[PDB]
Amino acid sequence: AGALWEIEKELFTKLPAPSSAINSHLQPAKPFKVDLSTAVSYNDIGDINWKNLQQFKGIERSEKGTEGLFFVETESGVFIVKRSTNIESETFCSLLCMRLGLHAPKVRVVSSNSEEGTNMLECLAAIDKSFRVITTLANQANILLMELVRGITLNKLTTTSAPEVLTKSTMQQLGSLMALDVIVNNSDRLPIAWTNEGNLDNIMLSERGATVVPIDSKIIPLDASHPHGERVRELLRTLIAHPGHESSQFHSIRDIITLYTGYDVGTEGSISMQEGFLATVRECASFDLDAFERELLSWQESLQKCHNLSISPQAIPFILRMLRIFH
Numbered sequence: 001a002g003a004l005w006e007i008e009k010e011l012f013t014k015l016p017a018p019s020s021a022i023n024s025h026l027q028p029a030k031p032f033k034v035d036l037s038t039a040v041s042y043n044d045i046g047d048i049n050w051k052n053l054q055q056f057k058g059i060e061r062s063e064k065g066t067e068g069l070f071f072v073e074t075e076s077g078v079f080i081v082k083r084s085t086n087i088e089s090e091t092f093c094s095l096l097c098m099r100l101g102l103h104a105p106k107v108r109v110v111s112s113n114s115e116e117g118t119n120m121l122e123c124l125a126a127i128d129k130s131f132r133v134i135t136t137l138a139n140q141a142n143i144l145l146m147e148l149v150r151g152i153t154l155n156k157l158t159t160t161s162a163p164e165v166l167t168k169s170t171m172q173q174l175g176s177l178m179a180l181d182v183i184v185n186n187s188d189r190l191p192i193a194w195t196n197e198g199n200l201d202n203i204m205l206s207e208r209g210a211t212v213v214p215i216d217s218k219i220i221p222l223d224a225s226h227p228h229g230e231r232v233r234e235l236l237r238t239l240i241a242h243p244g245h246e247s248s249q250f251h252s253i254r255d256i257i258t259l260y261t262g263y264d265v266g267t268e269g270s271i272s273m274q275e276g277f278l279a280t281v282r283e284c285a286s287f288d289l290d291a292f293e294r295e296l297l298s299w300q301e302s303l304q305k306c307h308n309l310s311i312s313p314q315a316i317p318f319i320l321r322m323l324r325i326f327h
């Protein structure tokens with residue numbers, strides 16, 4: 001919040017507005033409870049009036065994922081209040097995505113011990129009928145505010161829907177997302193440089209032209225001298241040499257998506273993802289690394305300054321190491 005938020009606004013502003021095409025296949029599931037199927041995303045989480053208790057209709061705890069995710073329904077829309085395992089990574093990552101062109105959900109950090117922090121907590125305590133909000137959030141030093149994203153996670157794609165959703169476009173985006181995860185060593189989402197069975201929960205497809213919107217983005221700097229280094233270089237090399245054919249790695253990741261969705265967007269699809277992945281790498285090579293490092297440091301500064309939130313000291317040099325390899 002504060003400087004950080006401004007920096008976010010700036011980045012967010014630069015993102016290419018997504019399609020104006022609403023894909024009915026991505027519409028959230030119709031179930032105090034919030035009907036995500038018809039709920040509208042609260043417009044500006046930079047401005048939330050915690051003192052106007054009458055604007056609030058209720059709060060629901062998402063029984064999925066972390067556990068600490070709540071949907072707040074005001075009269076102006078719905079936003080999300082969430083407990084985060086690693087808030088610094090998550091938020092810092094959110095920014096990085098937006099910087100790389102990715103449509104992450106707008107996120108804002110609220111310090112528990114601040115005027116707004118206390119105000120918000122008092123508001124939630126007033127509206128919570130579950131008796132679980134305060135006990136889960138009040139404990140935290142910083143709480144996360146998030147933009148409601150209307151869509152569904154990749155896993156939840158049927159097969160009878162996948163065709164109209166997994167267009168060339170979506171695929172390329174997916175490709176890009178992978179590049180990012182590589183840069184930050186995020187093994188959770190889409191494996192490529194990790195034997196993990198991945199996890200498609202961490203990725204949503206917005207109704208807005210099925211645009212890919214990542215979630216629970218995290219960073220884990222495996223620095224100094226590790227396999228990741230050559231591994232990505234290799235993949236890259238092969239990819240560049242003859243991008244006309246589905247590399248071993250993308251074939252693997254293709255399979256995965258093929259599994260959860262039971263839909264094989266064979267070869268043509270894999271190539272698309274490869275394209276997107278490259279497109280991003282290419283972009284990343286053009287980065288004036290001195291400037292970028294500063295951009296990075298600005299975020300870190302803002303993080304530390306607005307909330308005592310220090311991100312790992314190896315984070316930046318790592319993301320930079322990777323970024324250099326794309327050169």
Ligand SMILES: Nc1ncnc2c1ncn2[C@@H]1O[C@H](COP(=O)(O)O)[C@@H](O)[C@H]1O
Nearest residue numbers: 062064065066067069105147148149216
């Ligand atoms: N911005 C968002 N909009 C809608 N659902 C979300 C959003 N962020 C996270 N979720 C979800 O809530 C579930 C659990 O979130 P998470 O604990 O962060 O994995 C996810 O599978 C999604 O349905």
